[PDB]
Amino acid sequence: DDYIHLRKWIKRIGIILRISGHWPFRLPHEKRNQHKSKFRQVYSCLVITLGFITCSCYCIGLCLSESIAQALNNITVTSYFLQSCVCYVSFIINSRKLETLFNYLFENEVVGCPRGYKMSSIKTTLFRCKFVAFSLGILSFFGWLMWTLLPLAVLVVDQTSLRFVEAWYPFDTTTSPMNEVIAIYEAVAMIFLITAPMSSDIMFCVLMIFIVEHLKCLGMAIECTLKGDATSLCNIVDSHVKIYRTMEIVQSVYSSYFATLFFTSCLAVCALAYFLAATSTSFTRVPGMVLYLMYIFLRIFLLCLLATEVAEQGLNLCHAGYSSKLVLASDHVRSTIQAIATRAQIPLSITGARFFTVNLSFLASMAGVMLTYFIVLLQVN
Amino acid sequence: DDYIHLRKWIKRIGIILRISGHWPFRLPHEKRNQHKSKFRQVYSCLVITLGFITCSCYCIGLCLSESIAQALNNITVTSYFLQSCVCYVSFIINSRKLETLFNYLFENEVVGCPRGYKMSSIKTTLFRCKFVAFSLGILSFFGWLMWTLLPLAVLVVDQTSLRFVEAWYPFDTTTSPMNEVIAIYEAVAMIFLITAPMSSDIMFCVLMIFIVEHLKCLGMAIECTLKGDATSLCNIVDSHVKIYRTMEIVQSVYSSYFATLFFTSCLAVCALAYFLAATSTSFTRVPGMVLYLMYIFLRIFLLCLLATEVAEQGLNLCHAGYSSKLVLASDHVRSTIQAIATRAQIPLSITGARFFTVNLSFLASMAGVMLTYFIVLLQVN
Amino acid sequence: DDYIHLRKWIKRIGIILRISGHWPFRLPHEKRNQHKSKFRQVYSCLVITLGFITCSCYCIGLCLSESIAQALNNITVTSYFLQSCVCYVSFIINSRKLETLFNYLFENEVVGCPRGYKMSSIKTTLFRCKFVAFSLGILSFFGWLMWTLLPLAVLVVDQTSLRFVEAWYPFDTTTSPMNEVIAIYEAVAMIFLITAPMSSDIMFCVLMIFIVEHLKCLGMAIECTLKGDATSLCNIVDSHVKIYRTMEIVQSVYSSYFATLFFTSCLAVCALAYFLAATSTSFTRVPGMVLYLMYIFLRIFLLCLLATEVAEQGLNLCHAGYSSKLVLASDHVRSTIQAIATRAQIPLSITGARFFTVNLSFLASMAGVMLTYFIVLLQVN
Amino acid sequence: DDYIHLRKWIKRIGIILRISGHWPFRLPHEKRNQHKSKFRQVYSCLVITLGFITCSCYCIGLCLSESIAQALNNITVTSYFLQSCVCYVSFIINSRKLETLFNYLFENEVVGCPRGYKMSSIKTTLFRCKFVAFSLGILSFFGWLMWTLLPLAVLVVDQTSLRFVEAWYPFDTTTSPMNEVIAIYEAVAMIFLITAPMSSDIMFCVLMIFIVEHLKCLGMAIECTLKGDATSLCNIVDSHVKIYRTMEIVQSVYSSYFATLFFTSCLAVCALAYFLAATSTSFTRVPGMVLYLMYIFLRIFLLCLLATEVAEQGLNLCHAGYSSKLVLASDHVRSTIQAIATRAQIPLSITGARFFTVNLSFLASMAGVMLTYFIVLLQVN
Ligand SMILES: CCN(CC)C(=O)c1cccc(C)c1
Ligand SMILES: CCN(CC)C(=O)c1cccc(C)c1
Ligand SMILES: CCN(CC)C(=O)c1cccc(C)c1
Ligand SMILES: CCN(CC)C(=O)c1cccc(C)c1
């Protein structure tokens, strides 16, 4: 069966959310109260504390800067690291809503749709899910492998400064006793701090894909029940309000995370464009800086695209049922379809801490701001 | 009882609005026609005239500037002072509407809500009220104490220019006979001119908190009356129209005050960022200039947040009642819920003299404008 | 009677529209086919041709510029002159719609309003009409008197270049035979080219004031007919659709005129701010350049304010009738009030050639653009 | 008959779409399965491959640039060429939807309209169609003739570098054996690569004109059927939903094409304004660069105008039927007119890959961006 295949994938997503050290909540397939184990709790606490102290050493390493170039070289990695920290806190706080969200993915079976549509819907869902997940995973692995292991192959196979950008430490970390084990520590902390927000964006993309498929199924079900008494309309309205409650749940955690993400990502792409444009770099960091740019652009573009698709499917749900049969229906249908339309006129939008609406036009406005500040930072030299 | 506690707090707000010299109007708890006393009227007239002449000496002290730096050092304090003057005039003119607003806070008892919700609503209201009031009060006291008493401890405990920025005066004010009593006069005028707009923003924050709680109570009451004849719907519509009339009353006074506030606050934060960035300041004004920045950002952020919450609660009221029961109701309910929704689609927004809508996105746009003009003013040196 | 007073004023407006040389159309009070006279037609043709040739000499005088300063000194007057020419053409083309507009001002009597409201409405209408008309007229007279007669009192009472900015001419116009009669010709052409667009803005302000009063009367009439069968609702809907047809008529002519006006006015205020800031002017043109700025700002602000008031009154008409009585009315009232509301949700907006919406926020955006280009033009020196 | 005349014109449009080498689809007048011929398929494949290799040589000719000036001189032509390539791909992919679109133009006969309106509608349609088609065709022919044949008349009638801007080639192309035949090849490739997107914009303009006429006919038909049972309303709703399906079909292909078009057109007009402003050009390319500017501005303005007209006609359809008769109709009419209005409130907008809405305000925003980047590129020299 194809459907049990879908089961596999959502279990994998839950597994990855417990690999990178998020707080363990109840998965739908788990029914032995396994998430309350201490063996998985000390894991998440250890990884969260390690990420916190690494981000704090990097953040106070920024304020103790030598010049402008070291400041920007700290700005990029500290931006990504505090993105990871904001994501850690936001998944720590709202643990209960994630269980309801994963229960929504487990069963979402729409009633009233023709049976020929569900198969192609499941195939498109699995294809797009596999695409976004493997894309972000492979780009993350290549970027980490370059940025972390490329300077090690210059010296460790056989003077100082193995890592690309230094940070604040209580130890000296310049002598040969300490710098290698600092590099190893930075490697494993880099693994976890990269793995957390990528997994969060993967889960958000899965949720948006499922909500798009659900809204298309709802529109087809409205057309099917109008082509043909009350109970079908009650089930339609209940699915339409369940979708709205689910998006209202998704709004909060990703509101805080998206505000932090978008601001620090704009800072990171501006600093990267300055490093690639002006300063005569050492050419061993061009394959890192040309992959971090593509990762940032791909992540922002995928988030904005899957946030625009949901609003477009809601507005497409507004035009559902409007045909010649609606004129010939009773007063009951002409009232409930009117109610469904005037509720569907309100768009389902994910806002970033209510400062902006995550759309595709916001990507164009932010790219304009990035171009302006890149021109300014280039002129300042 | 908790509820009588709320009584205490609104009385305190009225008391503070008569301490800082606003025009005395009838409070709800007062029932002896006490507000028409001359003993409280000559107070407000004396304080308003003193604030007017102090703001006028500061304003014509700006045009008689020596250079650019003295001009900006006048620009900050004159911006805050004419904010205070605009607030004084706006509370002088519309005295009658403030009585209806304080009568709205005295009794606002929603009918039809389940009894278990009102307790937590009152607790959240008291907590957020105490938070915003004590926050702005303590920051104002620390900022005034620094800016006014820190230069006095250099000289008065034992050459000229005790105050930080000079102003126009008919007296000489440079000689030792006059400068000390000018400093004392500036201290008490500083107390009143700081105390007025902070108290106005505290009252606006109280009103927005109460309107948010009222809208949430209305949504819960709609859900409760749909879960269960006409009279409940009439009471719901009457509460919904009373909220709209109250916001329409709040719109005007704070429209004029918010236009003045936002423009002069942008000017003040730009001039402060220039003083903190470039000019080698004397380090005795860094604790003043680093608290005035935090006060400005906190005040603007709290105003924008509590103006966004009301619009979000209105749009959340639009989605109320939409469920399976609405399909099974009569024509009467399906008409009145439709009317409530198509009225709730119009957002309750506080505009600043109709030039802009006070939202959280406006804070981002204004911060972008502040960053652009700070870059320009830094480049001009 | 007060009402016949209103008659007087609209007749005066028609009279002024035929003084400045617009194409003569039928006024409401005229009933002898007087507008088809040739005695008033050769007037308008002569004045329009004179304004055309003066604007053409000024426009080709701009392209034959000596430097940047003479180019901007031509830019200001040519901007105002081609505003006048666009207004002349737009009133020449649509002569028929102006008759229907002046017939709308002649009789607009709303039915169903309480009688106590109409008196205060007429008083407020006459007050605001007199205010805007006398304000723009007196500022125009002072600006023309300064700019035209102030250099004449230096020389003509007793070497060359009497006028402030020269233009292209076939004659020499530098010798003493010709320059005085060129100055006289420029004086009378200046009178007509100033008098035309000011009269057009006065008529637009009158129309917006009347539409605001009409919408407030309609809202009060809806409240009155809901407080109390079908015929009142038919009269309400007919007045509401007549207001929309009138605004749709007003949209076109002022769309073209407002596009030209706003663009050339932004150019003029930028060039004036450059002349007042940098160049060491001769101080005999400071009273002209400081009145032209105030006239431009006052005209733009009054147009934007009276365009925002109409949209606000439409959205206020959306909330009319919504009360406890609407729940207790029949199906007929609950359907027609719903229809009135869903039609009133569409805003009555005057757009400038569909490029922008004339609001008060547009004034803030245009002022930001003016500040940016003033900073650039100051930096270019 | 006039109507058969319309037939002629749409056949001509189909003919031109098969002249410039687009993929051949079934026209409405063709009924012998002529579009599946190989004689017309190898034509389109040959022209598409030639345009691809020419665009690829120009695109890799950009990256192998000598300086900034040669880079911009490549940027303009490569922008137009990749516009042509994106249009080629977008017409290759969606071949099936173009058949339904051309079947919509073949028969669109509205039922219920008064007969006196259709004649003037057809006359206005033919006039505007002929205007836009002949305008873009004549400007394209003059621009191509100038840019391609003007340097040939300097040398070929009787040292190197016949073409204006060079490109990458495997051949030498500088010697006299090869440069002439390279110029001939560039001439014919220039013909096809210019002829494709102009024909696409002509078809889009035809579609927007027809949709505007259809919406006006629908509004007049609503007024006519309200002036007078169910079947007329069913036909009205079916025409209104057919218009929406047609615009939803038009959205996709022109979404991708409009995104590419608008971005590369902004780049091209910025580079052209730099070439015309600063660099001492050879004056033989001023008649080319002053026609390419007018072509770009005319094309963008016509696209934005005919995209704004459709949204304005939809919002005008929202106000249809609202009169005194609607109050006196049955419940059926007052429900179906309400449904038509609440569906017509959603605007029919053509978005460019969902990044922006093609309006006339977007033209103003893009012109502001063009002015800013032109000022920057002028300052960089
Ligand atoms: C900058 C984040 N980072 C830590 C240094 C990386 O290795 C890195 C680089 C490129 C792309 C990705 C997903 C991670
Ligand atoms: C600038 C206003 N002011 C008068 C000089 C102050 O003392 C002051 C400084 C910081 C924060 C607050 C609330 C007041
Ligand atoms: C610039 C237009 N103008 C002709 C030179 C004037 O005299 C002028 C100057 C200021 C204000 C007004 C209404 C007209
Ligand atoms: C830049 C495109 N191009 C190829 C060089 C042209 O000949 C060209 C120039 C002006 C106007 C038009 C429609 C085409």
Author numbering:
A (entry chain A), B (entry chain D), C (entry chain C), D (entry chain B): 12 to 169, 178 to 247, 317 to 469
Article sentences:
MhORs thus autonomously assemble as homotetrameric odorant-gated ion channels and display the divergent chemical tuning profiles typical of this receptor family. Using cryo-electron microscopy, we elucidated the structure of MhOR5 in multiple gating states, alone and in complex with two of its agonists—the odorant eugenol and the insect repellent DEET. As in Orco, each MhOR5 subunit contributes a single helix (S7b) to the central ion conduction pathway, and their S0–S6 helices form a loosely packed domain that projects radially away from the pore axis.
To investigate the diversity of binding modes used by different ligands, we determined the 2.9 Å structure of MhOR5 in complex with the insect repellent DEET. Density corresponding to DEET localized to the same binding pocket as eugenol, encased within the same box-like configuration of aromatic and aliphatic side chains. As with eugenol, computational docking of DEET yielded multiple poses with comparable docking scores that fit the experimental density well. Whereas each of the top poses was predicted to adopt a distinct orientation, all were stabilized through a similar complement of hydrophobic and/or π-stacking interactions. The constellation of amino acids lining the binding pocket retains the same overall geometry in both structures, leaving the architecture of the hydrophobic box largely unchanged. However, a small displacement of the S4 helix results in expansion of the pocket, probably to accommodate the longer aliphatic moiety of DEET and avoid a steric clash with the side chain of Met209. Mutation of Met209 to smaller hydrophobic amino acids (valine or alanine) enhanced the affinity of DEET. Conversely, mutation of Ile213, another aliphatic S4 residue that lies in close proximity to DEET, to the larger residue methionine abolished DEET sensitivity but marginally altered eugenol signalling.
